[PDB]
Specification:
256 residues, alpha+beta, Deoxyribonuclease I, Chain A, six-stranded mixed sheet, 26% strand, binds magnesium ion, phosphoric diester hydrolase activity
Length: 256
């Protein structure tokens, strides 16, 4: 039995709905769909918009109105979800949704963008720190873990079109890249690279400067699993032709 999980930074749920979201979701039929950047008060969402037949849904909004926010659709519900690491400043931005399924925890994470300022870059790296602490704690206790979402960093030079010009832009700073190295070193596997070693494989393109048509993109969205669980991973891929956001969806298929 295959379980298909999709992750997508939709850049606003209302926006992606105007651009074919429901038709796409109906045709793709994942078992679990993880979404980032909802940008909406869930309580203000009409049912025609939020509810999708055959799926349970769970929404984790930011304190700040219209900002960030994540959500999860699933055919089979988790036993519960956790919405933070236990650290106030990281738990109030609508960035963390951790669902407990039988066989794994599924981390649906919208990691912070560090471009804004040195303070937001500091926040990003310390968020990374708190995340690693959290997943390590769970992984240490014998849990298998799947982590998906927008990491807001391209790992290696192959993971973006313009590595040299972005050497001092947040998203490709040596400090950020080094954290992904560290995360991997700690026993988590970048599942896409298990199957695809090719260049030009990205998940985000600026809406500006015709980036998507020029494939001037960055691989910012990942599926990671812990080392012990990797044997269950059968596919990890990029749904590059799916429109509606500045990111495209990514997919994981696992056999349990
Ligand atoms: Mg966005």
């Amino acid at each position: 039995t295959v379980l298909k999980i999709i992750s997508w930074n939709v850049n606003g749920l209302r926006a992606v709905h105007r651009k074919g979201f429901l038709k796409w979701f109906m045709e793709e039929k994942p078992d679990i769909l993880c979404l980032q950047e909802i940008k909406a008060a869930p309580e203000q969402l009409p049912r025609k918009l939020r509810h999708v037949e055959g799926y349970r849904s769970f929404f984790t909004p930011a304190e700040r109105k219209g900002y960030s926010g994540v959500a999860m659709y699933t055919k089979v519900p988790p036993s519960s979800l956790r919405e933070g690491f236990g650290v106030e400043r990281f738990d109030t931005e609508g960035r963390i949704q951790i669902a407990d399924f039988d066989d794994f925890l599924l981390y649906n994470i919208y990691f912070p963008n560090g471009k804004m300022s040195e303070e937001r870059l500091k926040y990003k790296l310390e968020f990374y720190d708190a995340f690693l602490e959290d997943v390590n704690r769970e992984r240490d206790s014998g849990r298998n873990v799947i982590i998906c979402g927008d990491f807001n960093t391209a790992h290696r030079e192959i993971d973006l079109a313009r590595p040299k010009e972005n050497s001092n832009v947040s998203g490709f700073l040596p400090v950020e890249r080094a954290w992904i190295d560290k995360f991997i070193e700690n026993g988590y596997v970048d599942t896409f690279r298990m199957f695809n070693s090719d260049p030009g494989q990205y998940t985000w393109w600026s809406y500006r400067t015709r980036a998507r048509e020029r494939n001037v993109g960055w691989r910012l969205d990942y599926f990671f699993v812990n080392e012990e669980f990797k044997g269950k991973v059968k596919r990890s891929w990029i749904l590059s032709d799916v429109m509606g956001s500045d990111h495209c969806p990514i997919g994981l298929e696992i056999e349990l």
